[PDB]
C-alpha cells in the first residue's frame, strides 16, 4: 500500500515552499489511515516512544508525557494525543512519506501523529519549519495567520476532510482542532541554524584533533600601547579559522555525519547471531529483500554514502546510490557489487548494526 | 629593581623573531637574580603552584609533581626543579617581563624558573613557542638544532652565563643542562591554534544563543536522486558560517573575552571587607597607588578593554589606555574619569575581585 500525491510539484515549489501557505485539497485520493487511534495507541504506551497527552479544560492546559500505562478516564472532549517519529515504528505510516521525496531526503525529518476528540488540539503554535499536515479520519478546523504565541487574524481558514493537506512554511502561526475524532499526519521537514552548524564542526574538529596550526607572526606589526591586539592580527586568525572551514574533504565528512543522524530514538535490534558476508550474498541471490529501518537516515555527499552518522566507501557507485534512495533492496540493484567480499562485508556490519534487514 | 635590556629591537625582529634562534651575550648587564634558589624551592611547597622535579639517573628518566613537602634526599647532581607561572606568585620575578613588551601583550604568557645542579635538566625538547631563556647564576649548556624528541645535530651550542639570552623560535629542537648550580628564567609566549578558536568562538555562541538563523531555500534546486545534498545547498551552509564569524562585533567581543584569561592560576584574593566607589576615589587621590595582579592579562581590543575574560566599557579611553598598559597606577593616570561614579563603581568592582589590589 503506497500513497500518491496529487500535487502539481512545480507550480508547489514556485508559489508556496518556504513562502506561503496553503490547503491541498484531495491530495490524496480516497486516504486510508496506515494506523488507528487504538494502535496509535498502543504505540504510546512503549517505554521508548515520544508521545503527551495535551488536554485543555476552562481555560488552562495541561501536558501529560507518556509512556502512558492508563487511558482509563480521560473525557469525551478536548484533548489529544501527539506521537512523534511514529515512521521509527510504524511501516505503514512510514509508506506517507515517500511522495514527498521530490523534496531532498537530507531536509525531510520524521512523521508525526495526532488523534483528537472534537476541541482536541495543542493550541496556537508557531514553528521554525516545514510541515505538511495530512488529514485522515475526520475532520479538522485549520487556522493559519500572516508570517508575524498570542492569537492572530487567520488567512487561511479551513475544515480539513480526509485526503487534505495542509502546508505551512516556518513563521507562520497556526492551530488546529479537531470537529470529529482525528487522526493528523504531521510529515515534518528540518533545517539546521548556524549555532548548530559550527558547534558540530568545532566538535569534529576537536575529536580528530584537526586545526593544529598556529597563529605565526614573523612580520609582528608595531604598535602604541602593548596591550592593544591590532586589526589585522584578529583578520589574521579569522581567516585562518574561515580556511580551516573551507578545506575540501573535512568538512563533507563533518556534514556527512552530521545530517544523517535522526533527532529521536531508532528501533535499532541487531540481529543475533550476526550474519557473515556469505549470508548477505546468499541471501540477496535467493530473491530475498533487503529493508531500511525505518527513519534511518541515508544521503548521498558527493562520492561517499553516509547512514546514521558513519561513512559508507565503497567504488562502486550504482550499489551505493541504490542504497542511498531504496528502502527496499534487492540483488538486481547492488548489480556486481556483490562480488565484491568489501563491500559485501560493509552490507554485513550495517546489517549487524540493525541498520537493514531482511524482509521483516 | 627594574630590567634594562640592551637588545637592538629592530634587528632582532626584523632577522629573528619566529625566524632564527640566537644568543643574546649581556642582554641583560650586570644580571642580578629576582629570585634565590630557596625561596624558589618555597614556593614550590604550596599546593596552588605548579612545579616539577626531573631528575635522571643511568638513562631513564623521573618526573615528580609538586607539591613538594620534602626535599630531604636528592643528591648533588642530575636533577632539576621547574616553576610555572612565578611571576603569578613572585613580583619582583614579574619584573623580568617588563622590557620585553617590545612584543605585544596579547603574545606573550607566563615566567617559567628552573633551578639546576650540574647535569640537571628536562633533556631534548621540541616546542610550538617562542621563548626568552634568561641566565641567571651559574652556567649552563644550551644546544639548538634546525627546525625539522631524537637527538639533533646543533647549530647553536654556547655555555650561557648571567645576563645571557637563549631566544629560541618554535620548532627548534633544544636541550640545554647546568654545569654549575644554575637559574634559567624562561619569558614564554603563546598563539593560539585553528582548533581552540573555532572551539572557543562555538562555545561563545552556544552562550550567547546567537546563530540562530536557519537554512532556507525557497529555491530548492532539483536532482536526479532524492538522497544527494548538492554542493550549493554546502556552498549555503558554509556561507552562513563564514558571515557568522565575520559579524563586526562578536568576534571581537569572543576573543577580548577569550585572550584575556591566564593559562595557569592566579592569586586572587578579594579584600574584605570590599571597596566602596568613594574608597578608591580616597585612596588614589591621597596618592596610593593601584597595582595590578601578577599574571593578569588586560588587552585592548577596539573601544573595550578585557581583564581576565571579562569587558571593561567606559567612555573615558585614557583611563582604560593606563588600566591596559600600566601595571602600577595613581590618579595622574586616571585623569577627570575618577569623577565619573561608573567608572569609580568599575574600579571598585575589579579591586573587589581581587585584579588590581592598593600597594601590596
Redesign the interface.
Known amino acids: 500500500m503506497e500513497y500518491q500525491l496529487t500535487l502539481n510539484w512545480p507550480d508547489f ?1 514556485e508559489r508556496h ?3 506561503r501557505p496553503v490547503v491541498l485539497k484531495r491530495g490524496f485520493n480516497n486516504f486510508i489511515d496506515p494506523i488507528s487511534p487504538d494502535e496509535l495507541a498502543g504505540l504510546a504506551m512503549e517505554s521508548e516512544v515520544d508521545s503527551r497527552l495535551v488536554s485543555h479544560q476552562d481555560g488552562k492546559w495541561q501536558v501529560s508525557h507518556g509512556p502512558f500505562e492508563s487511558y482509563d478516564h480521560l473525557g469525551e472532549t478536548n484533548w489529544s494525543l501527539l506521537v512523534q517519529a511514529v515512521n521509527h515504528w510504524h511501516e505503514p505510516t512510514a509508506a506517507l512519506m515517500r511522495p514527498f ?7 525531510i525529518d520524521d512523521l508525526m501523529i495526532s488523534f483528537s476528540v472534537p476541541g482536541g488540539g495543542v493550541g496556537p503554535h508557531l514553528d ?1 519549519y516545514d510541515v505538511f499536515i495530512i488529514q485522515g479520519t475526520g475532520r479538522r478546523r485549520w487556522r493559519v495567520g500572516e508570517k508575524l504565541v498570542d492569537p492572530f487574524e487567520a488567512i487561511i481558514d479551513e475544515e480539513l476532510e480526509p485526503g487534505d493537506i495542509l502546508y505551512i512554511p ?1 513563521g507562520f502561526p497556526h492551530e488546529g482542532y479537531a470537529l470529529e475524532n482525528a487522526m493528523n499526519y504531521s510529515v515534518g521537514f528540518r ?5 548548530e ?3 558540530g ?3 569534529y ?2 575529536q580528530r ?10 612580520d ?1 606589526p608595531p ?1 602604541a ?5 591590532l586589526p589585522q ?2 583578520d589574521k ?2 581567516e ?7 578545506q575540501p574533504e573535512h ?2 565528512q563533518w ?2 555525519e552530521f ?1 544523517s543522524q535522526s533527532r529521536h530514538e531508532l528501533d535499532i535490534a541487531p540481529p543475533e547471531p550476526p550474519y557473515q558476508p556469505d549470508e548477505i550474498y546468499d541471501a540477496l541471490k535467493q530473491g530475498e529483500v533487503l529493508v531500511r529501518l525505518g527513519g534511518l537516515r ?4 558527493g562520492d561517499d554514502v553516509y547512514a546514521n552518522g558513519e561513512k559508507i566507501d565503497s567504488p562502486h557507485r550504482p550499489a551505493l ?1 541504490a542504497l ?2 531504496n528502502i527496499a533492496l534487492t540483488a538486481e540493484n547492488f548489480g556486481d557489487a556483490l562480488e565484491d567480499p568489501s563491500f559485501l562485508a560493509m552490507l554485513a556490519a550495517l546489517v549487524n548494526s540493525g541498520y537493514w534487514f531482511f524482509e521483516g
Chains 1, 2 share one sequence.
Not at 225 to 229: L, T
Open positions: 515549489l515552499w518556504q513562502k521525496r521530490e523534496l531532498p531526503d537530507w531536509r521554525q516556518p533545517a539546521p541554524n548556524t549555532r552548524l559550527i558547534s564542526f568545532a566538535d574538529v576537536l584533533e584537526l586545526g593544529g596550526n598556529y597563529y605565526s607572526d614573523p609582528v604598535r600601547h602593548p596591550a592593544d591586539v592580527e584578529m586568525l579569522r585562518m579559522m574561515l580556511e580551516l572551514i573551507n568538512f563533507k556534514f556527512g545530517i541515508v544521503l548521498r555527499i546510490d542511498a534512495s
